[PDB]
């Protein structure tokens, strides 16, 4: 009825005409864009991150786009535009490889955690013979949406979805849930989940999170310290995420002078410990950041930063602004069986 | 007699100071070695322990400096 | 539609060859998946008082070779494994290797011998394990060393409500004094030291005595230990009577800090080397697959000792004077 209210549409994907005709047809594996690929994206995200992401509204034939351009909308507001080179597919291959078979490469780094190497799409069987995986431009859209939903956790974890997952949990763990909701109010619990998924910490393993809450919230009602204790009880997931299956984890470290000047950050005069810190140092550390970083390749994940226990979150809150692709952890969030390889000396 | 007390208390503080800097250096050199997380957690806990002993020695030194200054103002 | 999914507790990934092996029956004709895993669960429950969940088997892992295996804790892999092809794991005496090596987990034997030799080992009174039985042993070591994540509050509730079927007024008396979270914490503090909680009755009687008076969880755990004299003595003396330095005891009076809700190890750090240096030069190596010897402490300092020495020698049991039967007989 045109005389009611309407609910805000979360995520809209506009296409120009050529992509809208391209999503008509089946792929090599015969799959539909709308009926197979998007749901499989959602399920894979749910296995990766503990988040139920909403379904996607795709509108064809945008007035505002060329035919090989696409746009993504947050809450009926466009968020970022994209382009696709015509008749090219995106696979991350080293410049060495891009010239070791004599194929074209077009450098176009479309978003930040995505490959930057476009090769003419007639070369597909060549890349299959060379055992190089390539992505359909539709699969490129899928990858860019996935990067969105990783980077845009914050806007989709509000209180009603937290309630929905807690009420799913009640079916199995009702007295645990009742203890948790005696200890933690629902808004503050949602805040804890948000501050977890800030650093790409999955909350798929709800059981361990709830157990750690029911331990630690016996005493402490600050949301952020409880988030820290949840991290320090997710040692196993953090170690598997960042040490990538090895005997060892290869991280960066701080300088202890930096650690002992981030004891400067204390703000006991205010309720929260907001940042009381020499303004120049936001360059002064950060220069030594920029000359230290290894550029990870685009399909993997960045090098890790290992900090002292109490200053992990302040480091992450500082360095997300330019480098959202840093995971900050501290000593308590890894297994004390792992050997840590000291290979940054950042002063 | 209060200068001798001051020497006593400053020696008793300086032994703790030397131990605390030894613990800091051992922290730093086991960071440089590539030890495990067990080692660093345990040494940080023991540093948090010996911080209180260092602070008690500092407070005793401050009390003894009070008394020596009072005896000088005699 | 889409919904939520529950975290799967224990997933066992298999390579192709093991996945073909688990189709067929074993030497005594009983099944890996339908008999041996349930029998492992039943034996674990009989030994320690813990209801472990059923086991999620995926065959044909892309990421493992065919005689390789992987174990997942909450859909996060915990340790990878290997099996030498066509070998069975039989602890030998090393000289045997020339009268007739892979240490897999730290409580598994290190001697793989080619599997054709079965009648030799049966005649020679040598116990052998199927590689399936080796998987069973490594899973058992997992669940011993990973008890803590399977004794949570809802399982404690389930066992309490099983108890209510028989001892409901005992249960109500216990839960009037003690919240369920603190009871689960007591159970965790018990099963940290591999103290079984199968015998719920004696634990509940000790609780209903002592929790009139004491509301600290840790003293109540100590009193449950001191009421499980019989179980501790039978575990540790192996049915015998007789199979530590005062200076350390008189320096652990140093550890009195109780200003906050808990206690605090308040000790000159260097003693963590003073115990350990003498510790390694005192220990008897008990035969691989046996029971390490047992450490006797003063009554109020038992937990501090166990918390201290677990880090390098996790499989050595600290007890104190009150926790043995009162009739059983280096620094």
Author numbering:
A (entry chain E): 362 to 708
B (entry chain O): 33 to 106
C (entry chain D): 363 to 462, 468 to 610, 615 to 700, 707 to 708
Task: Give sentences copied directly from the paper behind this entry.
The export apparatus is composed of a central, nonameric, ring-shaped inner membrane protein, termed the export gate (CdsV in Chlamydia species and SctV in universal nomenclature). The export gate does not directly engage the sorting complex, but is linked to the ATPase by SctO, an ~140 Å coiled-coil that is structurally similar to the central stalk proteins of the rotary ATPases- the F1-ATPase γ-subunit and the V1-ATPase D subunit. In T3SS, SctO is the key link between the export gate and the ATPase and is poised to transmit mechanical force between the ATPase and the export gate. Presented in this manuscript are structures of the C-terminal region of the export gate from Chlamydia pneumoniae (CdsV), both in an unliganded form and when bound to residues 25–110 of the Chlamydial SctO (CdsO).
The CdsO protein was truncated to residues 25–110 to facilitate crystallization of the complex. Most notably, we observed CdsO25-110 positioned within a large cleft at the interface between two CdsVC protomers, specifically, between subdomain 4 of adjacent subunits (the SD4-4 cleft). In our crystals, a 1:1 stoichiometry between CdsVC and CdsO25-110 is observed, and saturation of CdsVC in this way likely aided crystallization. CdsO25-110 binding is mediated largely through electrostatic interactions and stabilized by the buried surface area of each face of the CdsO25-110 coiled-coil with one side of the CdsVC monomer. The average total interaction area of one CdsO25-110 with a CdsVC dimer is ~900 Å2. Large-scale architectural rearrangements were not observed in CdsVC upon binding CdsO25-110; instead, small conformational differences were identified primarily within subdomain 4. Helices 12 and 13 of CdsVC, connected by an extended loop, were displaced by an average of 3.9 Å and 9.5° when bound to CdsO25-110, which draws subdomain 4 further into the SD4-4 cleft to stabilize CdsO25-110. The SD2-4 cleft is smaller, with helix 3 moving, on average, 5 Å toward subdomain 4, and the sheet formed by β-strands 8 and 11, adjusting by an average of 2.3 and 2.5 Å, respectively. β-strand 11 binds the loop connecting each helix of the CdsO25-110 coiled-coil; interestingly, this interface is mediated by H-bonds between backbone atoms of CdsVC and CdsO25-110. The CdsVC: CdsO25-110 complex has a Kd of 28 ± 3 μM, whereas the L638A/D639A mutant does not appear to bind CdsO. First, the structure reveals that CdsO binds in an inter-subunit cleft between subdomain 4 of adjacent protomers, rather than in the central pore of CdsV.
